[PDB]
Every structure is written in C-alpha cells, then in structure tokens.
Amino acid sequence: GEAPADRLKALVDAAVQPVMKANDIPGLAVAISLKGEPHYFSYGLASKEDGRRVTPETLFEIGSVSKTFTATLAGYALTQDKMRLDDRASQHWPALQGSRFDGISLLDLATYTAGGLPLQFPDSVQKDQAQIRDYYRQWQPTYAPGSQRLYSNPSIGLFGYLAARSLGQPFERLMEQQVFPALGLEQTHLDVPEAALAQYAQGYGKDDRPLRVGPGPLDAEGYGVKTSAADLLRFVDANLHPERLDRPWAQALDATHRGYYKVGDMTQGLGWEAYDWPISLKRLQAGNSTPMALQPHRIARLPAPQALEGQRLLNKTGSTNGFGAYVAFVPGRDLGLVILANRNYPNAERVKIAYAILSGLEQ
Ligand SMILES: *[B@@]([O])(O[C][C][O])C1=[C]C(O[C])=[C][C]=[C]1
Numbered sequence: 001g002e003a004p005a006d007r008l009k010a011l012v013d014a015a016v017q018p019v020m021k022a023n024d025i026p027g028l029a030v031a032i033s034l035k036g037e038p039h040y041f042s043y044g045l046a047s048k049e050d051g052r053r054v055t056p057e058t059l060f061e062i063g064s065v066s067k068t069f070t071a072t073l074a075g076y077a078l079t080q081d082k083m084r085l086d087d088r089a090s091q092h093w094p095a096l097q098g099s100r101f102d103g104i105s106l107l108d109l110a111t112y113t114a115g116g117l118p119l120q121f122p123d124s125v126q127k128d129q130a131q132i133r134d135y136y137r138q139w140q141p142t143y144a145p146g147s148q149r150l151y152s153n154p155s156i157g158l159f160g161y162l163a164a165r166s167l168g169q170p171f172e173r174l175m176e177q178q179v180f181p182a183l184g185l186e187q188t189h190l191d192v193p194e195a196a197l198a199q200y201a202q203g204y205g206k207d208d209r210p211l212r213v214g215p216g217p218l219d220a221e222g223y224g225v226k227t228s229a230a231d232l233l234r235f236v237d238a239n240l241h242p243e244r245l246d247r248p249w250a251q252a253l254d255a256t257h258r259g260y261y262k263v264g265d266m267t268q269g270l271g272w273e274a275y276d277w278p279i280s281l282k283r284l285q286a287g288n289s290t291p292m293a294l295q296p297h298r299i300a301r302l303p304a305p306q307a308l309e310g311q312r313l314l315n316k317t318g319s320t321n322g323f324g325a326y327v328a329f330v331p332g333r334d335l336g337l338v339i340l341a342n343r344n345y346p347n348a349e350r351v352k353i354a355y356a357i358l359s360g361l362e363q
C-alpha cells in the first residue's frame with residue numbers, strides 16, 4: 001500500500017517542518033536507513049539567492065561529524081599496527097619530543113582527555129605547519145592527562161594528524177585516496193572539486209550573512225568534510241554493517257565502536273558518543289548541550305573498552321559558522337539517521353528532530 005510511505009513522509013515532515021521554521025533554516029536534508037533501505041527527505045533551499053533546492057546530493061559542511069571520519073582513519077592505523085592507543089604522542093612526530101606530549105597518549109588526544117587542550121586553536125595559530133608545531137611544543141596541561149574531558153579540536157586533530165604520520169602520508173591524501181574510496185563515498189570531500197561546486201550549499205549566519213568554512217589549522221582532521229545526505233547515510237550504513245567492507249576497513253570501523261569512559265549518560269568512543277537506548281529526549285539533549293562542548297568534566301573510566309553496539313544510540317553533532325549537522329544510529333535496530341542543515345542551529349533542536357523520527361519509527 002501507500003500507507004507506509006505516506007506515514008514516513010508525514011512523520012519526517014512533522015519532525016522537520018516546525019524546527020526549520022522555528023530556527024529559520026533555509027535548507028535541510030534528511031536521510032534515514034530503515035530495515036536495510038535508504039529514504040531521503042529534502043526541504044527548502046541550498047541557496048536562497050539563486051533558488052537552488054536541497055536534494056539528497058546537495059553538499060553540506062558537516063563540521064565535527066568529520067571527527068568520525070578521522071577516527072576511522074585512526075582505526076585503520078591502529079588495526080594495521082602502525083600505532084597503538086597507549087603510544088605517547090611524541091612517538092609519532094619528532095618535533096614533539098621533549099615537549100609535554102612525551103606524557104600524553106594517543107587515546108588521551110582522541111578522547112579529549114590530554115589535560116585541557118582548548119576547544120579551538122587560538123586565533124594566533126594559522127593554517128601553517130610551523131605555527132601548529134610551535135603551538136603544541138609550547139602547550140602545557142592544566143590538569144593531569146587522563147582525568148578530565150574537555151572537547152577539543154586541537155586534541156582530536158592532533159590524533160588524526162599523528163595517525164596519518166604513522167601511515168607515512170598526509171592526512172588529506174589518505175582520506176581522498178584510501179578512506180573515502182574504501183567506504184564507497186564519491187560525494188564526500190575535504191576540498192570540493194570545481195566540478196562539484198554547484199552542489200555546495202550556501203551556509204547562513206547572523207543577518208543571513210553567507211558562510212562557507214575557511215582554512216584553519218587541522219581543519220581537515222577536525223571539521224573539514226563536505227558531503228551529501230546520501231553519502232553520509234552510506235557512511236552510517238558502513239557503521240551499521242562493518243562486515244560488508246573488506247576486512248581491514250571493517251576493523252577500522254569497529255575501532256570507532258569502542259567506549260573508554262563515561263561522562264554522565266554519554267560513553268566516549270573514537271569520534272562517536274554513545275547513549276543507552278531508549279533514553280529521554282531531555283537526557284540526549286543534555287549530553288549534546290553547550291556545557292558538554294565548552295566545560296571540562298571528570299571522566300569515569302571503564303575497566304576495559306566497551307563494545308558500543310546493541311541497545312545504544314551512537315551520535316555526533318557537527319557545526320561550522322554556517323552549517324549544523326547531526327548523525328545518529330542504533331546498531332541493534334539497523335537504524336540510521338542523518339540531518340544536514342545550512343544554518344548552525346542549536347544542538348537541542350537537531351536532537352529534537354532526530355528524537356521525533358526515532359520515536360515515530362518505534363510506533
Ligand atoms: B565541531 O563542529 O564540534 C561542534 C559540534 O559538536 C567543531 C568545529 C570547530 O570549528 C569549525 C571547532 C571545534 C569543534
């Protein structure tokens with residue numbers, strides 16, 4: 001019958017439409033993987049000025065959702081024995097020898113517990129090898145490595161950069177030439193080709209100023225991916241079924257499904273952040289709140305790494321000045337969701353859309 005497709009469209013419309021109006025979002029793409037089949041719902045405008053509509057092939061900036069791609073490359077380096085999570089960071093970059101990175105592990109970098117590396121590189125550090133080198137050489141922890149989580153682009157960005165060094169090639173090259181092709185992603189870019197630029201949505205900020213992300217230190221590792229809802233759902237489907245990939249890449253994906261510690265309701269993996277499922281909307285919003293991004297939290301370390309599978313929701317938010325992304329999946333239900341928008345609108349609102357869709361699918 002037409003009832004299932006009508007019901008899914010009604011459910012997704014009902015979740016999305018009020019949140020778009022309420023947050024003045026110009027364009028938004030949803031992709032859902034349900035019972036092994038993809039479903040796409042596209043809303044509004046990729047560019048207000050030329051009237052280009054959002055489609056499942058429109059490219060959006062996904063911001064820190066990029067960290068899950070970075071984690072997958074590190075997973076590859078790890079499961080290929082080029083590095084280990086307990087290595088000291090300075091083992092992989094001689095410039096860091098003699099610095100405080102002699103006493104910081106790769107796991108600490110990956111999971112934001114190196115001792116207070118900040119949210120962003122300071123404005124004084126430009127996209128320049130020498131400036132980045134000098135920044136890390138001089139940095140000193142605020143508190144003991146392994147004790148407090150402070151969400152940090154320099155932290156996980158260094159993790160990704162060191163993973164690339166361990167493999168003997170630049171990060172960006174490894175992503176384009178190995179990771180994206182291994183995952184079957186042809187609409188996923190760190191540097192959008194000229195021929196694909198017509199697909200790149202405009203981002204919108206205050207007063208609807210146009211905003212596309214500019215160069216920054218370790219931008220590729222931290223926040224550099226542009227992709228379509230269709231490709232990001234393919235990445236979600238790879239996460240739901242790593243066994244469908246060639247074994248080295250299956251192992252790399254599996255490495256991102258391991259939890260190391262908890263903060264509140266959240267279990268931290270490499271890239272992915274996990275919750276028990278079901279959990280309340282308010283709790284999932286709280287785990288994705290501004291204090292979780294901006295404030296340090298003492299960790300509760302697990303006795304051994306924990307498999308992030310079964311009745312769990314794995315997620316990641318991502319933001320740039322002009323864009324707001326959210327991805328969530330439930331391994332034990334073969335369910336995945338992607339929500340990409342061209343405004344940076346509050347995380348709580350992204351989670352509201354997702355939760356309405358997931359709730360509705362449960363009924
Ligand atoms: B990232 O998007 O995380 C925020 C949403 O959870 C992020 C992006 C940065 O620059 C664009 C810097 C830090 C984190």
Ligand SMILES: [Cl-]
Pocket residue numbers: 119120121153154216217222
């Ligand atoms: Cl940064």
